[PDB]
Amino acid sequence: SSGMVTDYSPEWSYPEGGVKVLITGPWQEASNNYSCLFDQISVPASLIQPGVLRCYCPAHDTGLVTLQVAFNNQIISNSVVFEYKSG
Amino acid sequence: GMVTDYSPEWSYPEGGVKVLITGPWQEASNNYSCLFDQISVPASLIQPGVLRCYCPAHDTGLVTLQVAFNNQIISNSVVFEYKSG
């Protein structure tokens, strides 16, 4: 299940967060221990189906941040840019 | 089959927003498309079960979003919204 993020949507959120984000990649594990880290802030993630993780982004100041996928809190993907826009 | 999820669920009237739609999409052939209130736009299979498309422009309001293959609808309809902006 370790590898690289193939896509994610949306690529941004307003500062208050609370936006669903889908992240695709080689995630296959059955165990419910996936999480997503936005600028190191962790939120739980759910495996919708093989290769598809869903999470609701956390609140964060405007700016660009790293978005990573972890399993048992261990980073298992590359970092991709996620943007918090002032809006 | 059925759409398992999709994101984002909305767009501004001008459209031009990337939308990922997940489900039982396995086909190898490059003939997937997405229908927004009957407006068709091409879609690409990023990887099994994952389709990417860029939504069309549309007047404010709720519309149906469906997945098709070879121009024939193969999924249920899910709500997609164009917000005033």
UniProtKB/Swiss-Prot annotation, chain A:
Induction note: Detected at low levels at interphase and in resting cells. Up-regulated during S phase and mitosis. Levels decrease at the end of mitosis.
Tissue: Normally expressed in non-neoplastic adult central nervous system tissues: detected in whole brain, cerebellum, brain cortex, occipital lobe, frontal lobe, temporal lobe, putamen. Expression levels are low in oligodendroglial tumors, and are reduced by half in oligodendroglioma and astrocytoma cases with 1p loss of heterozygosity. Detected in neuroblastic-type cultured neuroblastoma cells. Expressed in heart and kidney.
Localization annotation: Nucleus; Cytoplasm
Disulfide bonds listed in the record: none
Domain (IPT/TIG) ranges: 7-85
Coiled-coil residues: none
Function according to Swiss-Prot or TrEMBL: Transcriptional activator.
Other information: A very small segment of 1p36 located within CAMTA1 is deleted in all oligodendroglial tumors with 1p LOH. This minimal deleted region (MDR) also overlaps the neuroblastoma 1p36 MDR. CAMTA1 shows no evidence of inactivation by somatic mutations.
UniProt family annotation: Belongs to the CAMTA family.
Disease: Cerebellar dysfunction with variable cognitive and behavioral abnormalities: An autosomal dominant neurodevelopmental disorder characterized by mildly delayed psychomotor development, early onset of cerebellar ataxia, and intellectual disability later in childhood and adult life. Other features may include neonatal hypotonia, dysarthria, and dysmetria. Brain imaging in some patients shows cerebellar atrophy. Dysmorphic facial features are variable.
Subunit structure of this chain's protein: May interact with calmodulin.
Name the record gives this protein: Calmodulin-binding transcription activator 1
Source organism per UniProt: Homo sapiens
Curated annotation (Swiss-Prot), chain B:
Function: Transcriptional activator.
Protein name (record): Calmodulin-binding transcription activator 1
Domain IPT/TIG: residue ranges: 5-83
Inducing factors: Detected at low levels at interphase and in resting cells. Up-regulated during S phase and mitosis. Levels decrease at the end of mitosis.
Subunit annotation: May interact with calmodulin.
Family: Belongs to the CAMTA family.
Miscellaneous field: A very small segment of 1p36 located within CAMTA1 is deleted in all oligodendroglial tumors with 1p LOH. This minimal deleted region (MDR) also overlaps the neuroblastoma 1p36 MDR. CAMTA1 shows no evidence of inactivation by somatic mutations.
Localization in the cell: Nucleus; Cytoplasm
Tissues and organs where the protein is expressed, per its UniProt entry: Normally expressed in non-neoplastic adult central nervous system tissues: detected in whole brain, cerebellum, brain cortex, occipital lobe, frontal lobe, temporal lobe, putamen. Expression levels are low in oligodendroglial tumors, and are reduced by half in oligodendroglioma and astrocytoma cases with 1p loss of heterozygosity. Detected in neuroblastic-type cultured neuroblastoma cells. Expressed in heart and kidney.
Disease: Cerebellar dysfunction with variable cognitive and behavioral abnormalities: An autosomal dominant neurodevelopmental disorder characterized by mildly delayed psychomotor development, early onset of cerebellar ataxia, and intellectual disability later in childhood and adult life. Other features may include neonatal hypotonia, dysarthria, and dysmetria. Brain imaging in some patients shows cerebellar atrophy. Dysmorphic facial features are variable.
